[PDB]
Every structure is written in structure tokens, then in C-alpha cells.
Design a protein around this nucleic acid. Structure first.
Ligand SMILES: Nc1ncnc2c1ncn2[C@@H]1O[C@H](COP(=O)(O)OP(=O)(O)OP(=O)(O)O)[C@@H](O)[C@H]1O
Ligand SMILES: Nc1ncnc2c1ncn2[C@@H]1O[C@H](COP(=O)(O)OP(=O)(O)OP(=O)(O)O)[C@@H](O)[C@H]1O
Lengths: 743, 246, 743, 150
DNA sequence: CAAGACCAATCTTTACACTCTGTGAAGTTTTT
DNA sequence: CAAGACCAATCTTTACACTCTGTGAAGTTTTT
DNA sequence: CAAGACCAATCTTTACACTCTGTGAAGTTTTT
């Protein structure tokens, strides 16, 4: 490894933040203004003060602390192995020994030294920089040679891709100079000059005279090591100025230029760090800025290709594969493509860090689970799943109807806060391998399911039966296995009755369509109150039942009236004569149903008719409206039967958790099923194509309801309260999600 | 990257099998004989049609497909080019207020073959295809050109209806397209060309297109490689012109 | 409107490009290096030359053209209405009349002028700039006052968000100065000075003396109009320097700073352009760079909120709503979030422009369909759907198994080109309302379906029947309704036989499991050859059938052998005594099946056993392998029956397009169904959980097959050819997609 | 342009603390042959000189070359690289002290002095005859320093 | 009696080998 | 005989009203 | 009759020697 931990106390936006357990790739994600670049500034200042540069000290998070501390724990196990060995007697190795590992092995005795040598070596070097209130800086190690050597051994390479100079890639060479280490004593400036003069002269000695003249005229300073290696590279290679795919930089784009710059630099880093013991830490800001999603994916793919091409394992070995640890690569991204490709192509060698600024202003760093044990999920992992990492509140659902509802534009207009929550339908296995409960504190979430997934009532036996999900939930909820007393006695009682519910029996009425005295609403409320600790919300019925309740019957009926008035047309190219013929053949009163069947049919396009045709159509439509009102209020005894029939037609469930298909298969409620089929095939034929779940009736219903109620009432608080009254179920979930989002 | 053709390019993808016998026995590629060309009369015009069974037709077709389609042209040439159409020739002139129309007399017959050789030379590598007898460029022009039996005096001629003749005409006239386009641009005139019919339009309130100076200048340019202006079809109008009904 | 068209000929990366039919929001999308910013550079140079600035001319696309032209067609209908009217007699109006609309109404006569006045007014001003080869520039209108006035009336406001100075928002004020127009004759520098002196003096006259001194000392130039309005704004308002949410800019982030800068500027633009006749054109590059996806969505949402708050329609009217045309807002983005929110919140007022650089190097601009007539699709529109706009090749599929296959990491490793193609499962209604055929040239695509969607064979009747999708496809394919002869005679013949297939009958064998002589492969090949023109590919069988063919039987069987050897363990905490007890009670030979049922069970975790236990387990496993080999080759007559049984167990179809559930419902093939159930319940019980479509068997199968064949063969061309041989169906589709991607 | 190069300085806008624009002008002055020096012999020489085990430096240069994409050197870049490798130091120092510690007049005077000295010294052997134009050779200079400069 | 805080300068800090990768088997005044 | 191309300078170009939004009911030489 | 203006691409442009300095003794339409 390279760095064990980084700790910041009271500097910039950090109160007390510790980052550890670094992996080969560390993806940093988080909202805008959470401190992602503040880590960069802290590390940059720490390394600038490491080399004794003169810079302004960073600002304190709060002024009620007299200190601000930065702690770095360098991992010197591999360097200790490098230098302690008797073979490496070089001068650089001798310096590293005499600076770092001397005076540390001095204090240890023979027994402890031998124990360290023989056992699994683990040596760390902890360096703390403390900034006082008067801008003075104090180190925990008072030997500046140690700090300079630590800077040399673990160099910090740093890019903000936003401020890259696209048309001049010179800053690459400097970074290359930081990477590789070798000997320069043998190469003087005399042998090289003689070689060049012998190669460049029609008469021997001329080039040496020229260089002597230039040297005599100028006054310079001896080369530093990095300048030496840069000069030798630049002389050795064929060209200095950079060219993108055979074309000059200024003709190319900006995204292409930045992508190629980053790609070449990272490729050089990984390629050149193989043979040396220098372990850099590289920090990229926005590796995706100005890049097409395809280009960002390709950038990560090429990075992983180079990373895996030099990686040696128990199976992969041979020429060109090294065990040398890879440099610690941090990059802060706001692009789901970068994160998705990072996860999919790295697996266990990547780490996702979430930066969130809390309520007071401190930054919190958390680790989001990005390793999955399921290969199928890794292969099927796509942009939609990777988008979840950037969410603020994830509302997991089960079917597509909930997606249709919670994404409604008009509904989100009146609840802007819920616009920040991403809805994602999750299967049970997908929800299991995502592990949203691991984050919880990082990304709050809720899992929305129907109560059918818990209890399956049987009409024949008049018994509830517990699904295995209920047993598993109870098993996590019987916390009392190894605990102490707390105000959880109510929880134990609730679990006791939840286990007791199995043996109880409840009678049903109307051949199994209602409960005599059992209140499924009360059971749902108790279940939700108990299971709020598990972030799971269970609805009493299906989502169609939630939309269509006894209170929502009027507006829905109004929609029927509107769907009776506007969106059908006349099924003939000759409205006048056709309407006359159908009025003649079919009576207004006795045969209104076949007359409406023949005349009107659903059509998106509305041709304009004559005024008399409009009058006739309006009279027929009003007559049909009155007839349907009378028939509906006659064939059904109370409003509850009508609501249940509407739920069943659209695909909902009864009070006993039975669908229309389930009732047909089991054979119960023959009379109600026959009435529903009669209403579908005779009077409500035009609504038949809209009866299905995926037909999009939810969107039209919600849009019309919102528009109508906004027409009735003007104030937004009034409109929200009316929405809460009319849909007590959905508005509650939206309110809960928004309240959790606000905090 | 411009298109370059070498010996392998001719022998593999161009010839394929049309002149395999000549390349294996190192025998010179022959002229297009009169036996392969039939002479049709349409109006006062004479058309030359090659027979399909001859290998020359097939090599002309694959030349058109793979070689002449890659040489860059001039955007003022709206005819015989991929994506070029008459309506495109007549469109840039909707912005003009005065219109003029000129014609080149016998455009295809007046194309000098030496000009074709000079125009195609930079795009074909200078090698010897057949020993030391016939060069590659010579073989390709033997495939492309023809000798008119009616008029043997003018020698090799690019005839009407030789498959590759239109693209070759555009390539050889790119030079004059550039010259005339530059002159018109300096005069502020919109210029376009379809085959040999040239159309100019002035968007300004001026009489430049109706003057004899413009005709004289265009003719002086056209005399560089020996073309002439058909004086019968010269037309100049204001605010409305009709070209073949459009 | 503001701009009718923009045409570029032979400049920068454009050969001949015309952009027209602009809407209120114009989203520009496209790959890196396609010319999206080249439009910006062309417009910027055109407007710089409009004001007679001295700049270098832009480079020609190809040097074989002597000219390069930029044409702008300004829409002056509203300005003509403004100025022609007799009420507006101001000096600015008089200048606009005497410069633009004079000498244009001069040429017209009374009849034509009255016709223009009375009818729907539509007036345009076309301005062409031609750059010659010698860097000279020639206009089509030789009056510089006209060009300066056009620049003033239709100002170009331009931002590259990448190079924004975050900590100084001064460039806002300049742009504000460009927006609003009013009178300044009354405000001199004398009345203002007297007012300030009267307000600022303990003794009257002091401030006037001070200003007189300052004026006398300095030497200046009279104010321009924009400086005047800027000064008056800056004096009038409470503060100049900008602050983000009560905090100073340098303390805030970079993404937050850029977001707030863009938000305030666009808000000012839309708010201030309401009352004036000046119609700006604003061009934003990368409105998303450095922004969290949530922040980009919120940016577009606020933009739409401001846009709709001032929009007046037949229903929305009253105080604060204007009919004034909105400025033309172009922004080039690479973020799916920006495009998604733009589409969802604008609808018919947005336009998506696709920039693609072809093969030679010219830029192509196309319009991608972004308006949907389905409200349900608009509400359900999400990140996954909006990602499709950035695709290079869309492979629409039907079920999740194809998604599992085509996203396989190992499979994509050997076909890198297909990694650039995004796979998206599309329902029939979703595929209908996406309209992927409208783009085609912009974003090439293919729709992958099973042949079952075309023809439904009946075993009882021995007849094919044509699904309505076949009739609809034939209806689009009978092009000959109003056409002329072409080499389509073969197509007409193929459609004739496709209609004839209905009346034909084909016998079946083995109770309806095979075809006597009919070749479904031949029919599939003919259908695909005919329908390639419609970008639809039909597979002979389901995807499970495509994976499991007669040729893939060996490797699959090897997988079974491997799934027999490795991934089960012993179902007991005491392997030694348990294995001894089961060896004692159950014989090795006679009762191998119950012995393996009791001993081995599938388990992800593999505890380490004693060497003798490993030996016993290996012997038992080898015996079971031999027994299964013998039983499988005995109970099935030929290899084809085994392949069909494997397809049916996993959920495929037979040759007659019948699933296991379909066969069970219809009752045919009782013997084969019984054999399959016996093999599932007795010998292949361990594979039973992996029998389902969503169990992920495809991923494991493909991974193991790829790893094994790569172990056998080293060369990548060899491995690809082996893949093509072993899966002739899937490799063909990948090859076709890659070939279409390359071109 | 190549034969009679124009060298041009406005002393007012001189970057005092970075004397890099000297090298470019030096590249304009002298002319000699570079066909014999390839990038293979030099790499072998350096690798033989810089290696505890032969061949390592050549492998390193091959890796760097394979990763990057560049354009062939121009002549002036070639001569600049050869100078900068040959000499002992690149960064400039005034009388043993770093530039940022020294003054502004001293820095400008030394810059102009070294550049003119290099010009006259190096133009002796070649047929390239430059034209050099200095603006304000005296700005920021004490009268004694201007006299000493001349 | 005895004690934390004991100047600032002063010297090639960039790789080795077996292992092409791993690190190892005759004035005044002041101090006085 | 007659014709495209006929200097460069030279002057408040920023809103109005009814309509709080829409635009309207006694030297040489040269030209000579 | 005859004439100025006859594409744009396409290839190591950096020193030599005797002289340490001097350069030398079976569709429409268009072109047709
Ligand atoms: N000197 C400072 N003192 C205190 N707090 C500061 C200081 N500088 C910055 N901050 C805080 O740190 C944050 C600065 O945003 P920062 O760049 O650290 O986050 P980020 O996630 O990188 O932003 P972005 O997502 O735009 O890149 C803000 O919360 C700001 O209040
Ligand atoms: N002077 C020029 N002459 C010819 N082609 C040019 C010139 N400048 C740029 N180009 C071409 O135009 C393109 C430049 O990319 P451009 O910035 O126009 O595209 P972009 O889509 O904006 O890029 P990005 O997606 O990175 O923002 C390249 O194809 C380049 O070859």
C-alpha cells in the first residue's frame, strides 16, 4: 500500500475527518459544495509545507479551536524491505536508511527487531502538521530532511481538469520527472559534448568550441535531478511537442485535447511506476469535464486495460507482469458514466467515497458499497443503476405503475422537494444485492411494497398466512437476542401479536370481498409504525387501490364524464348522414348503448363537425352520462362496491388481497365478476383499452385531477391540502420523503 | 490524406481480372479499339458507347467506383458528383438580383488529354507497370480515354458516354472552376456550374452581369485551356430568369 | 421568431451546412470533435466582422474552393411592425426605418405594399459574408450602417462555461447592457451633479466643486450607450459585487459558482428581454461542466420556470404575461441530465440537434425527434431513455435475457467495437413512440425480435398464421403502390410468398416437436434479408435457443461437469461422519441419485475438508458424472432431442415455437414433458434454481465458455472465430453492429 | 527570413525572473549538421552510461516513446536540446544569487548583456546575419550601469 | 537548588542486481 | 464608340404610448 | 480572332573545409 490514513481536524470545511483503507482506484462523489476539492487543497498545502515552501496557512473551520491538524500515515513497509536488505548498498538507499529507518530501529532491541523482521512486516510513519492561531506551523518530527525525503518518496501529483491548458501539454514532463529514479554520476557534461562534437562536425572540435563559447558567456546554476531526467528524456525521444492523432492541438477540440492529455498522463504514470519504489499519489478533479459519455467510458476502459496489463496474480504471470503496488489514484467526478465504468471494470480494487456537508457545515466522508458478489448484476449494471449513487433519496418500488405515478410532472410541480428523490423499481434480488441498508446514513432510502408480500389471506380457509419475508423481517426485528432492556417493550409486544396473527381466523362477507370486523388499515398502520426502523413502507392495497379510494370516487367519476365528453369522435367519414342513420335505427331511450357503440369511438384526432352534429352529439352524450349514473348507482348497493369494482377492473386487489384473475381462478365472487364483465363489455367498452396497468391511465387521471382541483382552488397550500385529503396514501409517502430530504 | 495508386493498387483492386493476362505476360495494355466502341447519333451530337463484355468497361466501372470518387473537387461543380443535383445548381442564385447564364461549346470534346494527364498525375504514383514499356498512368489513361475514328486529327478524346468521362471532366475543369470562382468572388458574384452550363448572379443593384466586360473576362479565362463560350445560349436578365423552364 | 437560417460553406469543419427552424431552446448534442463549438466560432467571427472589428479570417475547410460563405437570415417581421407603425415616431425607430426598411419598401409598389401590410407579414433580411482566398472579406450589402444596426438589434451573447472566471462575475453587466433600450437625453451630467451635491453636503456647493475639480484634471471620452446604462444600473442598485447565498465567492465551490453565474445570467436575460424589441441570440457551451446531475436538472428546471412564468397563451393571461418572442438559446451539452430535463420540461418548444463528423471530415447537422405525443412516456422518461440520444448504435431488444447477454463483460472484451453500442430493451409501444426510424441516418439502430412475433404455428391445425406485425411490415414493404420499376422484382416475389405462407400447411413429427421438411432457418434467413431495409432482425428461436444449439452442446455439457465439480458442498457441519453415514445407507451404484441428493448441495461458500473427504467426494462426483452421461445419452435418441429438452427446461421454444408452459397448457408432447420433469426433479435438481430466465445462468455460461476457449486457444482472431462457430447467431449480430459502427 | 533573422526585444516588458527567451534567440543564430546524430546512438550511449544492468534505460525510453504521441523536432528545437544537454546548467543566476532575490534593473541589465554577448560571440563563424532591435536598452538602469553596458 | 526551551552553517537525497522484476534464497562613559 | 469598377469625411443609432404590454383599433527640367 | 488572370499537393532548407576563419589560391429531369 501507499497511504494508511489521512486525518484533518478543524481546517477548511472539515471538523474531524479521517480517510483510510485506500484502494487502487478511489472514486470521490458528492453534492456540489461538500468539500471534495477541500481534501485536494489540504493535501496540496500539506505537501507544499513538506518541501518548506512559503505559503499562506489554510483557514480554520471554526475559530473556537486554537489548532488545526493534518496527519499523514505513510506506509513504509516496502521501502523498509527495499533499504534494510544487504544487497541494496546504493547511495540513495543509504540515505533512506540513515534518514527514515535509522533512529527508529535504534530504539528497538534484538528480540523486537527480529520479531519485526520474521513476522509480517507492517511499518508506518505518522507525520502531523499543526497550524496555530497565529499562523505558525509546528511538526511532530523536527528533522526537515525526513520531511523532504517523505515528499520525494511519495510524490503528490495533482490536476484540476477544468483549468487545463489544452494547447500546451508541457506540465506532463514535470510529472514524469517525479516518477523514475536512476543514476547520473557516470554521465558528465564532457563525455556527452565529445560524443556530440564527434557526431556533429565536418572538422573535429568545432562543436566543443561552440559549447565552450556558450558556457563562457552565460552564468547558470547546476541542474537539479528532475531537470536532468527531463533533459535526457527530451534529447532521447523523437519529438517534444504533442500531436493528437496526427493533427495539431490547436485544430482539435477541447474535450478531445483534455481527454488525450489525461489519458497519456495516466498511462505514463502506471507504465513508469512499475520498476521503481517511488509510490505517487495522484488526484484528478473532474476527469469527465467536456467529455462525451462514450468518451468518459472509453477513458476508464483504457485506464483499466493498462492497470490489468501489468497486474500479476496467482493465475496471470510471466514477462511484463509486476507485483509493484499501484499508485493511489483519487478522482472526483460528477458523471455517472465514469463511476459506472469504474465499478464494472475494477470490482474489488475500487472504492466509492461519499462527501456530504451536514447541517452545521462539517464535511462527512462515508464509504458506499460498490462491490457486488453477483456476476449477473455486474454485467447488467447500467447507467440507471449507477445513477443511484448520486441520489439524495432513493424510493425503491416494485412495479412500473409506481414509477408512472411518482414521476408525474404535475404532481411533482406541487411538491418540488420530492423532485430531488429518484424513484427506482427494484426486484427482491436486485434490492438484496444493491444493499441500500449499508449506506442508509449516506444515502437515505425507503422500500415501498404492498402488504400482500407479507400476509396472504385465504378465502376458503379464512386464515392469514405469513410469507417468508415477514419471518425474515421479524428475525431482524427480534433484536432482544443479546441485548439489555430499553423502551422496546412495545416492539416486543407488536412482534408477539405479529406472530400470533397466524393462528387467528377472520370471517369474510359478500363471498370474500370485505372484512366483517378486521381493519386492514389498522394492521397496515401497526406494520408501518413497527417497520419504519427498517426503512420499509407497506401500503394496504395496490397502487391502483391507493389512487382509487372511496374519497376519490367523485373526481374519478368526473374524469369519466370528461372522458365521455371530449376524447371520442364519430366512427364515420360522414358524421351527418351516419348520425341520422343511427338515430333512426337505434332509439334514444331503449337502445342508447348500441347507439353510442355505433356513433362514438375513441380517437386522438378530432375532426370538426357541423353545429347541428355537435348539438346531437352533446344531447346523446348527456343522455348516456345520465344513464350510466343511474345504472352505476342502481347495480351497486353502496359506494364501496363501486370502488372495489373499479379497483378490480383496473387490476387492483380486494380487501382480502385478491385480484380479478385470482378470483376467477379460485372461482369466488361469481356475481361480482359477472357484473364487472358486463360493465366492461356493454357500457364501459370505450375504457376497455385503458383498463390495463401499462395503458397509462394513471398519468391521465393525475393530470386531469390536478388541473381540475387547481381550477377550483388557487392557493398552493390549499391545493396541497386538497391533494392530501383526496389521496391520503400517496401524499403521505411524498411528505415523508420530502421531510427526510430537508433534514 | 490524398488518394495514391501504385502497381499493387492497379493489379489487385482495380484490374482484379480484366487485365490479368497482360500483367502476367508483361504485355502492353492496348488502346480501346474501334471494335469495342459503337457510334450513336443523337441530334447533331455523336455518342460513343463501349461494349459491356470488353474488360475496358469493367475496369472503367471499378476506376469510377474506387479511384475517381476520392479526388477532391470544386464545390461550384454541381453535376455528376455524389450529392450534386440541378436544384443545387439553381439554388445559390435565389439571393441574386441580376442573372446571367453562359455555356461552354462542346465541353467534352474540347477537353485536352494532356490536361487530363496533368490533372491525374499527382494522384497516381509514377511507376512502370509493364517492364519499362508502359507506365501506370499511361495504362490508366488508355483505359479512360479513346481515339475518335471520325476525327483522327485531334487524337485521343474523352468521349460522351464513357462511364468515367463526367468525373474526369469535373477533375480536369477544377482548375478553371477555381479561377472563375475567385474572379467572381472578387467581383461579388455568386457562381455555379452544372456540367458546362455556368450560372452567375449579382445580389447587388448593378449592371455588371449585363455588360460585355463580364463575357470578355470569362472568355479570356476560358481560353487558358482552350475552351470557348457558346454565344447563342448567352443570356442576361434582371429580377427574373428562366433556365430550361425553372 | 429571431433567426430563420444560418448557412456555412467551406469554413472550419463545415462543407455546406444549413441550420433552420429554430425553437426557443436548441440543445446541441454530438460526439467529441464534430464541430459543435465550430458553429460558435463561425457565429462569433460573423458578428465580430459585423461591427467592423479587425480579426483574422477563419480557415477554409478545403483549399480547392476560392470562397467561404456565412449567411444569416434575420427575421425582421416584428421590427417591421414596430417601426412601420405611425405611433412610434422616436429617433431610434426613425433610424431603424431609414436604415433597414427604407430602400426595401421603396422598390415595391402600392399593390404589393398593401398586400404585405394586410396579409400575414413575413419579412427577412439576408446577409452574406464571403471570405476570399487572399483574406479579403466581401458583403452582399455594402452599407455598414445596416450591418451595425443588425448587430445592435440581434445581439450575440456568448459563454464558454469551461473558461468562466468564477470569482469575478463582472462580464454579467456588459451583457445586461446589451439587452434593454431606453432614452437618455433628459439625464445630463448637470442635474445629477446638483442632485447629488444637494443630497451630499453639510454646506451647499461643495460636491459640485469637487466634481468640477476632478473633471478639470482628467481627460476622457464621451460615454457610449452601454456604459451609460451600466453606470445607471450600478448607481441605482444596492450592491455591485456578487455573493452566493450570503457567502463570499472565493469561499464557495467552483461548480456552485458556475451554476449560480449561469442561472443569474439566463434569468436576467429572460426577465429583461420581455419589454423590448431587441431579440438576442445566446450560446452557452457546456452548461453542465462541474455540476452534479441534480444541480444540472435543477438548473434546467429553474430555466423552464422562468420561461413559463412570462409565457402568454390562450388559457394563461393577465398581469405579468407577455407575447414577446423569447431569445434563441443554444447550448451544447454532453450531459444526459440536461437533455432529459430540457425535453421533459419544454416539450414542443425544444429542438435537439445532432452534430456528426462523417468520413471525409465534414460536419452533418440533423434534427433528432424529441417531441412525444404520449404523456405517459413523457412522465416515465428517465435517464436511461435520454441516454439513447448520445448513443452511436442502439440495439433494441425485447427481454432482459438479451440485456444480460449483450452486456457480458467477457464477451465485450473480445469485441471492443460493440462496446460502443448501447443495448436498450424496448416494448412495442415504447418502440413506437420513440420513433427510432426518424433518425436512422443520425443514430443507426436495429430492432431485435423473435420470429414468434411474426408467425404463430398451430400444432393442432398444422397451419402458420400471420401476426398483425407481419401484415403491418408487409404494408410498409409493398412500396410499389405509386412507384416505378427497379431491381425490386425479387422483393415483390418475396412478399408474394410471404402472403402465400398463410394458406400452406406443414406436418410435424414427435407429437409436434420437429418439422418434417420445413426449414425455419431458411424462412428466418429470407425474412432477415427482406427486412434488413427496415433495420429489424428476427431470430429463428428465443435467445436461450440461440445460446443452446446442437453445436454448443459439448461446452455446455462441460459446464455441467464443472458445475458438478466445484460449486456444491456437503450439506452438513460434519463432513466426515455424514459422508460415512450416507455411504453406508445409500449404495454407490444402486442409489447414487439419493446419495448425491443427501451429500452435495449448491453453496457459494466452500469449507475446506480433509483429504480423505475430498477423495470420497471426487469419486462420488465422477461416478455421478458417468451416470448422467449414460442416462442422458440413453433416454434421448439423438443430440437434437437433448438440445430441445435443454432449451425447453430453461424456458425456450421448440421448432414449432412452443414453450414448456404452452405445451403443458395445450397438452401435447406428454412423453417429452414427463421426461423433462423427471430429469428436473430427480437428476438435475441442483440446476433447478438456475432454470429460470432471470437466474443469471446466461452470464455464468458465457463467462465459463469464454474462459475455457481462451484456455484452449491463445490468438484473439482464433478466439473470435471459435466464438463465431460456437454461437453463429449472436456473433453474427455483434459483427453486423460493429461493421455498421465502423462506417 | 532564415538567412537574416529578426531578433526583437522590448526591455520594458521583459520577464525578469525567467530568462528562457534567450535560448530561442540562440537557436536562431548558428547553423550545423544533424544527420549523423539520430535518436538511437544517443539512447545507446546514455543507456550504457546510465545502467547498473545493460539495457534498462533503453527499455525506459522505449516505454515513454510508446505511450506518448509527438511531432518530429524542428531544427531550432534540436539545437536548443543539444545545447541544454551539453551545458552544465539551464536556469540563470546573477553573480551567484537567485534571480528573484536580485533587483529589476540588475536583472534586465544582465539579461540584455548576456544576450548581446551571445549574439556577437556566436555570429562570428556563420553566414547568418541577424538584425537585432532593442527598445529602451536603459530602462531601470543607473547611468553608471548604462555606461558599463555600452 | 534545578529545569523544559540547547543558535545557524556545515558536505551529490535519487536503483541494484543473479532475479528484466523483486528488495532474497594623555580623555569621558559602559560592562566590571 | 461605350462600359461594370463612381474616393474618404461629413451629423446623438438606442422606447412609445391610451394599451404596464403590444407596435393598434533674369535659370534648368516636367506636365503642356 | 486572341489575351493578362495557368488550381492545390507533392519530397530533410540549416556548414565545409586545406584555411580554427574565410567561401579560395422498365421512370422523370439536367448537361447533351
Ligand atoms: N476558507 C474556508 N473556510 C471555511 N469553509 C470553507 C473555506 N473554503 C471553502 N469552504 C467551504 O468548503 C466548501 C467549498 O466547496 P468545495 O470546493 O470544497 O466542494 P466540492 O465538492 O469540491 O465542490 P464542487 O462539487 O463544485 O467541485 C463550501 O462548503 C465552503 O463553505
Ligand atoms: N482551422 C480549422 N480548419 C479545419 N478544421 C478545423 C479547424 N479547427 C477545427 N477544425 C475541425 O473541427 C473540429 C474541432 O472540434 P470542435 O470544437 O469544432 O467540435 P466540438 O464538438 O465542439 O468538440 P467538443 O465536443 O470537445 O466540444 C475537428 O474536427 C477539427 O478537425
Amino acid at each position: 500500500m501507499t497511504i494508511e490514513s489521512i486525518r484533518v481536524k478543524n481546517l477548511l470545511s472539515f471538523d474531524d475527518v479521517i480517510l483510510r483503507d485506500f484502494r487502487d482506484i478511489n472514486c470521490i462523489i458528492g453534492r456540489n459544495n461538500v468539500g471534495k476539492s477541500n481534501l485536494l487543497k489540504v493535501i496540496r498545502y500539506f505537501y507544499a509545507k513538506l518541501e518548506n515552501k512559503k505559503v499562506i496557512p489554510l483557514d480554520f473551520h471554526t475559530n473556537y479551536n486554537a489548532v488545526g491538524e493534518i496527519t499523514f500515515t505513510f506506509d513504509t513497509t516496502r521501502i523498509k524491505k527495499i533499504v534494510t536488505s544487504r544487497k541494496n548498498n546504493g547511495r540513495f538507499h543509504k540515505h533512506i536508511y540513515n534518514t527514515l529507518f535509522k533512529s527508529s530501529s535504534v530504539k528497538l532491541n534484538f528480540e523486537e527487531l527480529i520479531a519485526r523482521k520474521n513476522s509480517t512486516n507492517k511499518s508506518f510513519f505518522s507525520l502531523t502538521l499543526t497550524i496555530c492561531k497565529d499562523d505558525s506551523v509546528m511538526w511532530s518530527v523536527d528533522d526537515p530532511k525526513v520531511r523532504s525525503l517523505l515528499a520525494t518518496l511519495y510524490p503528490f501529483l495533482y490536476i484540476e481538469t477544468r483549468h487545463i491548458d489544452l494547447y500546451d501539454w508541457n506540465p506532463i514532463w514535470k510529472l514524469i520527472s517525479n516518477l523514475n529514479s536512476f543514476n547520473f554520476d557516470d554521465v558528465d557534461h564532457d563525455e556527452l559534448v565529445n560524443f556530440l562534437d564527434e557526431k556533429i562536425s565536418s572538422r573535429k572540435g568545432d562543436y566543443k568550441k561552440y559549447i565552450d563559447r556558450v558556457v563562457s558567456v552565460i552564468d547558470t546554476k547546476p541542474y537539479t535531478y528532475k531537470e536532468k531526467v527531463i533533459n535526457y528524456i527530451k534529447v532521447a525521444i523523437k519529438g517534444d511537442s504533442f500531436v493528437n492523432a496526427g493533427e495539431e492541438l490547436f485544430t482539435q477540440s477541447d474535450g478531445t485535447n483534455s481527454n488525450k492529455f489525461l489519458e497519456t498522463l495516466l498511462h505514463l504514470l502506471i507504465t513508469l511506476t512499475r520498476t521503481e519504489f517511488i509510490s505517487p499519489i495522484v488526484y484528478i478533479d473532474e476527469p469527465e469535464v467536456g467529455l462525451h459519455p462514450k468518451l468518459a467510458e472509453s477513458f476508464v476502459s483504457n485506464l483499466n486495460k493498462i492497470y490489468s496489463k501489468f497486474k500479476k496474480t496467482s493465475e496471470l504471470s510471466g514477462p511484463g507482469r509486476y507485483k509493484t503496488p499501484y499508485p493511489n489514484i483519487f478522482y472526483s467526478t460528477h458523471s455517472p458514466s465514469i463511476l459506472k465504468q469504474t465499478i464494472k471494470l475494477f470490482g474489488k480494487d475500487q472504492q466509492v467515497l461519499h462527501f456530504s456537508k451536514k447541517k452545521d457545515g462539517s464535511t462527512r466522508v462515508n464509504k458506499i458499497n460498490s462491490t457486488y458478489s453477483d456476476e449477473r448484476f455486474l454485467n447488467i449494471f447500467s447507467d440507471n443503476e449507477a445513477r443511484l449513487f448520486f441520489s439524495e433519496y432513493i424510493v425503491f418500488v416494485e412495479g412500473a405503475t409506481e414509477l408512472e405515478l411518482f414521476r408525474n410532472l404535475s404532481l411533482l410541480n406541487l411538491y418540488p422537494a420530492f423532485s430531488l428523490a429518484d424513484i427506482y423499481d427494484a426486484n427482491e434480488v436486485i434490492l438484496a444485492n444493491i444493499n441500500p441498508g449499508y449506506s442508509k446514513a449516506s444515502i437515505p432510502f425507503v422500500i415501498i411494497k404492498d402488504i400482500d408480500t407479507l400476509i396472504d389471506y385465504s378465502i376458503k380457509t379464512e386464515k392469514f398466512s405469513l410469507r417468508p419475508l415477514f419471518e425474515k423481517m421479524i428475525k431482524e426485528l427480534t433484536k432482544e437476542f443479546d441485548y439489555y432492556d430499553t423502551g422496546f417493550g412495545r416492539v416486543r409486544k407488536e412482534i408477539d401479536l405479529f406472530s400470533d396473527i397466524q393462528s387467528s381466523t377472520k370471517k369474510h362477507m359478500d363471498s370474500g370481498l370485505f372484512f366483517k370486523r378486521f381493519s386492514l388499515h389498522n394492521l397496515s398502520s401497526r406494520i408501518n409504525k413497527v417497520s419504519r426502523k427498517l426503512n420499509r413502507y407497506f401500503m394496504t392495497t395496490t397502487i391502483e387501490g391507493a389512487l382509487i379510494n372511496e374519497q376519490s370516487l367523485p373526481y374519478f367519476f368526473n374524469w369519466i364524464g370528461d372522458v365521455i365528453l371530449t376524447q371520442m369522435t364519430i366512427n364515420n367519414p360522414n358524421p351527418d348522414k351516419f348520425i341520422e342513420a343511427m338515430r333512426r335505427r337505434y332509439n334514444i331511450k331503449s337502445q342508447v348503448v348500441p347507439l353510442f357503440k355505433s356513433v362514438f369511438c375513441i380517437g386522438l384526432n378530432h375532426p370538426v363537425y357541423s353545429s347541428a352534429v355537435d348539438k346531437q352529439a352533446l344531447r346523446i352524450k348527456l343522455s348516456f352520462l345520465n344513464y350510466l349514473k343511474r345504472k352505476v348507482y342502481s347495480d351497486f348497493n353502496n359506494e364501496k362496491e363501486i370502488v372495489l369494482a373499479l379497483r378490480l377492473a383496473f387490476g387492483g386487489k380486494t380487501e382480502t388481497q385478491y385480484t380479478l384473475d385470482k378470483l376467477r381462478k379460485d372461482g369466488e365472487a361469481e356475481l361480482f365478476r359477472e357484473k364487472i364483465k358486463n360493465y366492461k363489455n356493454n357500457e364501459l367498452f370505450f375504457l376497455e383499452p385503458q383498463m390495463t396497468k401499462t395503458s397509462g391511465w394513471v398519468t391521465t387521471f393525475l393530470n386531469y385531477t390536478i388541473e381540475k382541483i387547481t381550477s377550483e382552488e388557487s392557493d398552493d397550500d390549499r391545493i396541497r391540502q386538497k391533494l392530501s385529503f383526496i389521496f391520503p396514501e400517496i401524499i403521505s409517502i411524498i411528505e415523508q420523503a420530502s421531510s427526510s430530504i430537508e433534514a | 490524406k490524398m488518394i495514391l495508386v501504385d502497381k499493387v493498387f492497379y493489379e489487385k483492386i482495380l484490374s482484379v481480372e480484366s487485365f490479368k493476362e497482360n500483367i502476367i505476360t508483361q504485355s502492353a495494355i492496348p488502346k480501346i479499339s474501334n471494335k469495342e466502341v459503337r457510334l450513336i447519333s443523337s441530334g447533331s451530337k455523336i455518342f460513343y458507347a463501349i461494349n459491356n463484355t470488353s474488360p475496358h468497361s469493367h475496369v472503367q466501372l471499378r476506376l469510377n467506383r474506387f479511384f475517381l470518387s476520392h479526388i477532391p473537387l470544386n464545390s461550384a461543380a454541381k453535376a455528376f458528383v455524389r450529392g450534386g443535383s440541378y436544384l443545387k445548381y439553381l439554388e445559390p442564385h435565389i439571393y441574386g438580383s441580376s442573372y446571367c447564364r453562359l455555356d461552354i461549346s462542346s465541353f467534352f470534346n474540347n477537353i485536352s488529354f494532356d490536361d487530363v494527364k496533368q490533372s491525374l498525375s499527382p494522384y497516381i504514383k509514377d511507376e512502370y507497370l509493364i517492364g519499362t514499356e508502359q507506365k501506370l498512368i499511361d495504362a490508366i489513361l488508355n483505359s479512360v480515354g479513346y481515339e475518335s475514328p471520325i476525327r483522327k486529327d485531334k487524337g485521343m478524346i474523352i468521349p460522351m458516354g464513357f462511364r468515367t468521362s463526367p468525373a474526369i471532366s469535373n477533375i480536369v475543369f477544377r482548375k478553371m472552376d477555381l479561377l472563375i470562382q475567385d474572379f467572381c468572388a472578387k467581383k461579388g458574384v455568386i457562381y455555379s456550374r452544372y456540367a458546362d452550363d455556368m450560372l452567375f448572379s449579382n445580389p447587388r443593384e448593378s449592371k455588371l452581369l449585363m455588360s460585355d466586360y463580364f463575357i470578355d473576362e470569362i472568355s479570356s479565362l476560358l481560353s487558358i485551356m482552350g475552351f470557348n463560350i457558346n454565344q447563342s445560349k448567352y443570356i442576361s436578365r434582371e429580377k427574373e430568369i428562366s433556365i430550361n423552364g425553372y
